[PDB]
């Protein structure tokens, strides 16, 4: 009796983020042991529709007025299969920049993650109106796994705003295995709570290729380059073995179906990439 995976897809928005006249909700129940599944639809706790069908999958679509949807009601897709409930819920996505606040949530450095083996995600909140012990920041793991030990920095910026930080330490394995990290900001000003997530980047990986170069210069000093290419999460880390500022590095740019240059003025060009085999590192050298 393999358990079904339940997710809701909705109508997309105008190229200009405008709402459809009518919003379709699609309930995807997929990847379960062929049996008798039934999908109950629940508008804010009350049944709106029912559907029953007998490693397959099934779908059940529910439609909504643009106004009904904007009513910020909470819709629940309730799969009952082999005598056990599964569900997913949704409502109109709350305003993400409430009163204009912004909250950013970093991914770990591929260096921070494999070399230093001490990963940290950081939740940043800017443009806050200055307050005191009003501002609460709260971490949580998607799994439900426990969480403790997090920074809190409520420091005050030049332009009159409050900028709150909270750096949380994260387990490489936990991360690597697709964990999802939630950062939850509450405030007496905000009508609700801001919330940002972050997870291991989806898609197929591909290890890097590296190339240490040089072209001796005219007190004559010689310059060193590196072409780390064809890797498949943008997330990469480059260093020369030497300080992380004695060299410069371009931003990743998609090649022929990414790549980075590294310029070291002064040996070894190390690429710390997630896909890279064996220690999670490719690298080369130049004379």
């Amino acid at each position: 009796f393999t358990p079904p995976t339940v997710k809701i897809l909705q109508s997309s928005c105008d190229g200009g983020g405008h709402f459809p006249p009518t919003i379709q909700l699609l309930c995807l129940v997929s990847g379960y042991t062929p049996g008798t599944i039934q999908i109950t639809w629940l508008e804010d706790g009350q049944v709106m529709d029912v559907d029953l069908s007998t490693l397959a999958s099934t779908q059940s679509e529910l439609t909504l007025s643009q106004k009904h949807w904007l009513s910020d009601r909470t819709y629940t897709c309730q799969v009952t299969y082999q005598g056990h409930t599964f569900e997913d819920s949704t409502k109109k996505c709350a305003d993400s920049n409430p009163r204009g606040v912004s909250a950013y949530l970093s991914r770990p450095s591929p260096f921070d993650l494999f070399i230093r083996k001490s990963p940290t995600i950081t939740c940043l909140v800017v443009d806050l109106a200055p307050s005191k012990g009003t501002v609460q920041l709260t971490w949580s793991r998607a799994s439900g796994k426990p969480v403790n030990h997090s920074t809190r920095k409520e420091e005050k910026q030049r332009n009159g705003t409050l900028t709150v930080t909270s750096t949380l330490p994260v387990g490489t394995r936990d991360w690597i295995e697709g964990e999802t990290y939630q950062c939850r900001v509450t405030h007496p000003h905000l009508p609700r709570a801001l919330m940002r997530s972050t997870t291991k980047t989806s898609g197929p990986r591909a290890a890097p290729e590296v190339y240490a170069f040089a072209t001796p210069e005219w007190r004559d000093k010689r310059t060193l380059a590196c072409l780390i290419q064809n890797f498949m999460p943008e997330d990469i880390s480059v260093q020369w073995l030497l300080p992380d500022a004695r060299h410069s590095t371009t931003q990743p740019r998609k090649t022929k179906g990414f790549f980075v240059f590294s310029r070291l003025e002064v040996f070894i060009c190390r690429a710390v990439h997630e896909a890279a085999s064996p220690s999670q590192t490719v690298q080369r050298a130049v004379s």
């Binding site: 009163r99 204009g100 606040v101 443009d127 109106a129 200055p130 030049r158 332009n159 009159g160 705003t161 000003h189």
Partner: protein
């Protein structure tokens, strides 16, 4: 000698904006006599030429000045010169019905106040130390705008 009052108080308005000068009377725009007798002079949909020295009389009463601007943010002000303890209102005003967000006032360089939406300064007890060069930062239609600076000065008098 009568004095000239402005409603609203702002001696700096936007184009198209109104304002009413209150004071069997004569009016003096730029120096030229206006064709208005009423004690109150009306200004509908301001044009640029509506700028300039104004004054009234029944014994001739001194001048008040009205600037007209077209722009995104106008730092309006109650009075440009005040005497201690008198009311002073500051107002970061935005073009038309347009909405100015993330508004911050600056006095002499420093961040006086910031708020998510628009706000105004109001002092019932104009502190002599308030004299400063003011200006206000805003956000209109997602874009950044700094207001034209405005010098303001209080006067403590024995």
């Amino acid at each position: 000698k009568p004095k000239v009052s402005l409603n609203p108080p702002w001696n700096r308005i936007f184009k198209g904006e109104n304002v009413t000068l209150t004071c069997s009377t004569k009016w003096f725009h730029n120096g030229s006599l206006s064709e208005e007798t009423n004690s109150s002079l009306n200004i509908v949909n301001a044009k640029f030429e509506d700028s300039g020295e104004y004054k009234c009389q029944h014994a001739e009463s001194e001048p008040v000045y009205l600037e007209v601007f077209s722009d995104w943010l106008l730092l309006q002000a109650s009075a440009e010169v005040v005497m201690e303890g008198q009311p002073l209102f500051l107002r970061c005003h935005g073009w038309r019905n347009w909405d100015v967000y993330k508004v911050i006032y600056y006095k002499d360089g420093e961040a006086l106040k910031y708020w998510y939406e628009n706000h105004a300064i109001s002092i019932t007890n104009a502190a002599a130390e308030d004299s400063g060069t003011y200006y206000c930062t805003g956000k209109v239609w997602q874009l950044d705008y700094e207001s034209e600076p405005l010098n303001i000065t209080v006067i403590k008098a024995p």
